[PDB]
Amino acid sequence: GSSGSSGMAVNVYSTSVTSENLSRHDMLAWVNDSLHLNYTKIEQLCSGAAYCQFMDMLFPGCVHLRKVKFQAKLEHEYIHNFKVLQAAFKKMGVDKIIPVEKLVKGKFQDNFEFIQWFKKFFDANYDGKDYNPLLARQGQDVAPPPNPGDQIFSGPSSG
């Protein structure tokens, strides 16, 4: 009845003429601003660690960031993070299969789709609450804080 369905995923339809799709830049900027990510390539999201940190933001208590590897460097480390994440999906009842065996690969295509839908899928649940991604793994202020600090000067000229 009324009671329940508290923490569920609001499927995404968007079945209409209108079509709002972002590009490599944006697609990344969205996440880089969501949980303060520094991904320079959509393929980077392959790690999954990002998708895992999102579940906690939208649906708290559904995903375990502890079992997630934000420092994942190898391929196997990409699957592990996805594993725990998959739980958050079935936990609520997400009918969006998570292609890890592929996502891990680190492709630029199979990724675009996932993330592409990961955006609208976040707005269908995100009402307007503040979520601190850092506080999730905060310890000693000393440690180097994550920042997009990146700039490369260039541009040859002849005169």
Swiss-Prot record:
- Keyword field: Cell cycle, Cell division, Cytoplasm, Cytoskeleton, Microtubule, Mitosis, Phosphoprotein
Does Cytoplasm count among this protein's keywords? yes
The source's superkingdom equals Eukaryota
The yes or no answer to whether the keyword Cell division is present is: yes
Tissue and organ distribution = Predominantly expressed in brain and muscle.
**Location, primary (coarse class):** cytoplasm
Picking any one GO biological process from the record gives:
protein localization
Q: Which residues form the Calponin-homology (CH) domain?
A: 21-123
- Subcellular localization, as worded in the UniProt entry: Cytoplasm, Cytoskeleton
Task: Give an example GO cellular component term for this record.
Answer: microtubule plus-end
> Molecular function (GO) terms listed?
identical protein binding; microtubule binding; microtubule plus-end binding; protein serine/threonine kinase activator activity; protein serine/threonine kinase binding
Query: What is recorded about the domains?
Result: Composed of two functionally independent domains. The N-terminal domain forms a hydrophobic cleft involved in microtubule binding and the C-terminal is involved in the formation of mutually exclusive complexes with APC and DCTN1.
Function statement: Plus-end tracking protein (+TIP) that binds to the plus-end of microtubules and regulates the dynamics of the microtubule cytoskeleton. Promotes microtubule growth. May be involved in spindle function by stabilizing microtubules and anchoring them at centrosomes. Also acts as a regulator of minus-end microtubule organization: interacts with the complex formed by AKAP9 and PDE4DIP, leading to recruit CAMSAP2 to the Golgi apparatus, thereby tethering non-centrosomal minus-end microtubules to the Golgi, an important step for polarized cell movement.
Q: How does it assemble?
A: Homodimer. Heterodimer with MAPRE1. Binds monomeric and polymerized GTP-bound tubulin. Interacts with APC2. Interacts with DCTN1 and SRCIN1. Binds to the C-terminal domain of APC. Interacts (via C-terminus) with CLIP1. Interacts with SLAIN2 and SLAIN1. Interacts with AKAP9. Interacts with PDE4DIP. Interacts with PDE4DIP isoform 13/MMG8/SMYLE; this interaction is required for its recruitment to the Golgi apparatus.
In the record, the note on similarity to other proteins reads: Belongs to the MAPRE family.
Q: What is this protein called?
A: Microtubule-associated protein RP/EB family member 3
Biological classification of the source: Eukaryota, Metazoa, Chordata, Craniata, Vertebrata
Q: Report the gene name.
A: MAPRE3
Span within the parent record = 1 to 146 of 281
